[PDB]
Design a protein around this ligand. Structure first.
Ligand code: NDP
Ligand code: NDP
Ligand code: DQF
Ligand code: DQF
Ligand code: UMP
Ligand code: UMP
Lengths: 534, 534
């Protein structure tokens, strides 16, 4: 029987990153700068705040007032339009512009030793000490009580264990800050929910929920009848996914990746393969990432992008020469170019690192006769890359905007047939979406890079066609987890994503061929520590 | 109040189709066969036995106290909870001794000719319906299920003592002499429709008719995370009245109907290559379990002769439109005309010479197309033969793909393929297929495309000694033509019937050996033909 649970006392805050790297929850702790917010205006966190702190459910008040009376050993509490209490520090209250006060449809309280009621109303309550809030809540009709802080207010409320939940906005950008939110003891509080990732006012943010740790139903039976035929399949335990299965709302788009790992681990088919390692496999998944709101670089481990950007630039040049990448210490294709690998593909007459008519060649020269990686292929075969950029510019409603790497004629001449079969483009209202069909998906190692590659490419094609990127849609055919990744992915699934980074391109690049490694910036990448998947 | 609502009195039945048909009309009354010669019309449908036992035995203890109050209040009152089951005397006498009385249920028999002295078993005898109501008032029980006789169903419906009918549609024909009463669409309407299943060589589903009226903390968190919830298009509510009245839409035909709904409500208005304009969206997945049913749409009439002739023409490697015209199959007639070929700039193409389309790419990818009469034997890649060989000899291959999108040949085709590729998956003796469709006409094309690739999956599985599992349909540019909207509004307010089954001649062992007479669609129950156009 606890005071926070009786009077439904919650903290709501927005924390940015702080100018001074290992990341943790404490990375997000910036509250204020010189008695104001560290940031200009984040209009989406403003709207979330207003909606959370003003929302009330009438039909739920009976149970709340009952509990409050029952616990105070009273039979009654004492307009009749139910509202929330909002508590502020003095410095916080005096931060707020005058006409923005008092906060609308909320009972405004102000912790202060040096204000006094008789220069405000009794609409706008005041209290000298913390215990004077519990007293005032005891005498009030209110839905819930929200601590809107000040670093001081939050500090004393958390250490006195008077907070049931923290509504915590992660502002994923760095500002000058002089006051910080206190370090949330992850023994005292734990995250039970994570929102979608959003862009507002040139930053990404998400909304998480910390919870104090515990140290017609005619149609409800019809649901049970429809499940009468429903079915550990693979030797995977519950305790394994404790944090993953503890979350209620898992709306962060990184869960589209994590949920597929979970599904293959729980329900996947045990299969041998080419590699001789064994996999769990399933067939047919879709993920969708909103490139207008974030860059979906996985945050539950560290990912590097230089190599995958160089690979894409090498595709766009129409190159097949593995040495070009090796000379820049990009080793993605090294194992596919060895004497031994090519001899096993029966490419006995192929030079080492001559990968044959792979992506680059099919994108710029589909149907040209491959000779060797040094030949001049200029104006030979179909320049599909040019054709799709022309169709996007000149016939945006075409349903034929496809870039295909799967050249059936040339497959046996490639060091290996492409995993990334095709990209299809869709244009609507100045916006570009991309579907990539992937025949073979290594969920542990390859798929995180593959999402980054095709997200970057969707931004590159958008910018050179004067469009804004919309959705990257990733279609997985044979989707597999290598048995040697299972322990590593167990670790990864029990990590809570961070708000995603943003991709910035040099805005001066207007032709697909003009991009260089320096034209790409990842911003505000906050990530858990690197995992070796093997 | 109402007697059926107080005492929670339900009917549960299983109805087959009855022997009376080239033009036969279908309605809910198609499923009416109950019994034959005092027993069931069929041998054993084990999945319906399972459903029957789960529905008539399920109780929810925590829900009982509320029902006790309801029944106490109506009457003016103060081991495990069980349901009551009521049967007719003839029904009772049909059950074998070893299954009588029905286990974990309170058994009740209606009889005039027999009294309790005539029964050894723990059963209540009642000689009047009125006495059932008295008995229910005197028992502790969860729900009351009327198990039939036709005589029993007839009188309980007549008296409006039925709150809901749990109705199994057995999609096969048998000799019957007793029939379920014709249901009045004004008294009872369908509220829920299950998945489709196969059991003992028949398809079936489970529908629910309803009597027409002729921590709750994370609940707030759910609203908080929903604070940013904004329908584009001028579609009216009442236009989807039946569609939106259903509680559970689990019939797999709703995968199709729900995509139509989504495009009508959220689709992007766009011109197209055609001039009609569309509503469009990008990226959907449907999954059809071919082990349980053949997914031939039931919300309108479809014939398969043409699409089977088209598939056999594809497999032969043919590009000659005249071959289909001579079988009165006009699917490709418009794309082979002088005008169409000239508008494609194929001035040097004979009428109905469709160029290197599907059949040619499947049997001869990379061969130079000449004309539709040439002998292309051993020219180009026989992909079809290679994928059959991979399925048989290397089943865990992630390279089992059939690709029609030959970038080099697109401009020589009457038109570029909509169905880009088929990828195959093999696990535990079963064959699954993904088809990726770049361009999907939801109103006219997609219904046929589902049937086409579902048949092809069955053909490939049989010639490789596998059982078909899933057909997975991935939609890229998915569009509804403006001229189809009013016909699709009608279609979406139709309730699917249990699906038919497809049988193949099991003597066919090679992909090239199928003929039209090797295919039977059985038990196709469908709503009326719709002209999608005006
Ligand atoms: N990012 C976010 O979510 C939020 C940021 N902010 C920002 O944070 C800053 C405000 O933070 P901070 O400087 O810590 O100031 P606070 O708003 O926490 O104010 C603290 C003052 O409130 C009173 N107080 C605190 N505890 C008690 C107590 N136990 N009994 C009586 N009075 C008490 C005292 O005022 P006195 O004794 O003088 O009367 C104390 O000096 C600003 O920059 C503001 O814009 C504020 C809220 C949320
Ligand atoms: N597919 C399905 O879901 C079902 C199929 N069946 C099949 O139905 C057939 C049996 O149906 P049907 O022939 O209609 O017989 P019923 O099972 O409806 O029983 C009829 C008998 O029950 C008694 N009865 C009915 N109403 C009353 C009443 N109001 N008061 C007193 N007694 C009453 C009478 O018994 P008495 O003669 O002793 O007075 C009457 O002759 C069988 O073929 C059985 O297999 C049955 C149920 C479900
Ligand atoms: N999730 C979350 N939790 C929170 N506690 C707060 C917050 C931050 C500072 C003050 C207050 Cl009352 C609330 C917010 C920021 C959005 C709401 O911010 C407001 C609302 C009303 C007035 C206001 O002051 C405007 C100017 C202040 C300045 O110049 O810095 C700020 N989000
Ligand atoms: N959905 C649905 N609703 C229903 N009312 C019934 C039904 C059908 C006949 C009798 C009875 Cl008690 C129930 C069923 C058929 C499956 C249940 O089948 C049973 C269960 C227990 C006994 C039994 O008796 C065999 C009848 C005579 C024969 O063997 O032909 C049949 N499904
Ligand atoms: O960009 C790539 C390249 C490879 N792979 C993985 C998928 C398979 O594990 C393997 C490709 O080999 P096959 O599927 O063809 O055997 O590498 C990816 O996920 N992405
Ligand atoms: O099997 C087929 C063939 C065609 N279409 C439809 C899709 C488009 O409406 C049109 C092809 O037009 P383009 O996408 O090629 O413009 O035909 C199908 O749905 N299925």
């Amino acid at each position: 029987e606890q005071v926070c649970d009786v009077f439904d006392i919650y903290a709501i805050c927005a924390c940015c990153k702080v100018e001074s790297e290992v990341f943790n929850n404490y990375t997000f702790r910036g509250l204020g700068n010189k008695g104001v917010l560290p940031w200009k205006c984040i209009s989406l966190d403003m709207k979330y705040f207003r909606a959370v702190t003003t929302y009330v459910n009438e039909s739920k008040y009976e149970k709340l007032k009952y509990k409050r009376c029952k616990y105070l050993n009273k039979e009654t509490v004492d307009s009749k339009k139910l509202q929330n209490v909002v508590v502020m520090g003095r410095t916080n209250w005096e931060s707020i512009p005058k006409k923005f006060k008092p906060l609308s449809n909320r009972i405004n309280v102000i912790l202060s030793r040096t204000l006094k009621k008789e220069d405000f109303d009794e609409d706008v309550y005041i209290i000298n000490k913390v215990e004077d809030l519990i007293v005032l809540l005891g005498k009030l009709n209110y839905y819930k009580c929200f601590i809107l802080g000040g670093s001081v207010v939050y500090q004393e409320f958390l250490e006195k264990k008077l907070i049931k939940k923290i509504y915590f906005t992660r502002i994923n950008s760095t500002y000058e800050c002089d006051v910080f939110f206190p370090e949330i003891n992850e023994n005292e509080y734990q995250i039970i929910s994570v929102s979608d990732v959003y862009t507002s006012n040139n930053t990404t943010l998400d909304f998480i929920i910390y919870k104090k740790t515990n140290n017609d139903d005619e149609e409800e039976d019809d649901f049970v009848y429809f499940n009468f035929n429903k079915e550990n399949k693979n030797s995977i335990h519950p305790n394994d996914f404790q944090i993953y299965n503890s979350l209620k709302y898992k709306y962060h788009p990184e869960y589209q990746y994590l949920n597929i790992i979970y599904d293959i681990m729980m329900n996947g088919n045990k299969q041998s393969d080419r590699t001789g390692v064994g996999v769990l496999s399933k067939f047919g998944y879709i993920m969708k990432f909103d490139l207008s709101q974030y860059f979906p670089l996985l945050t539950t481990k560290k990912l590097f992008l230089r190599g995958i950007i160089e690979e894409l630039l090498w595709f766009i040049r129409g190159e097949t020469n593995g040495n070009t990448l090796l000379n820049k210490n990009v080793r993605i294709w090294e194992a596919n170019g060895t004497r031994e690998f090519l001899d096993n593909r029966k490419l006995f007459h192929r030079e080492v690192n001559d990968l044959g008519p792979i992506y680059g060649f099919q994108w710029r020269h589909f149907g040209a006769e491959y000779t060797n990686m040094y030949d001049n292929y200029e104006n030979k075969g179909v320049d599909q890359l040019k054709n799709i950029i022309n169709l996007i510019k000149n016939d945006p409603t075409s349903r034929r905007i496809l870039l295909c790497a799967w050249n059936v004629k040339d497959l046996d001449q490639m060091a290996l047939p492409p995993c990334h079969i095709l990209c299809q483009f869709y244009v609507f209202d100045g916006k570009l979406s991309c579907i990539m069909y992937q025949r073979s998906c290594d969920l542990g190692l390859g798929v995180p890079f593959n999402i980054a590659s095709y997200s970057i490419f969707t931004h590159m094609i958008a910018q050179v066609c004067n469009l804004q990127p919309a959705q990257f849609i990733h279609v997985l055919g044979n989707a597999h987890v290598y048995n040697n990744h299972i322990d590593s992915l167990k670790i990864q699934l029990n990590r809570i994503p961070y708000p995603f980074p943003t991709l910035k391109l040099n805005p001066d690049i207007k032709n697909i061929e003009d991009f260089t490694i320096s034209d790409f910036t990842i911003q505000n990448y906050v990530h858990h520590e690197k995992i070796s998947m093997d």
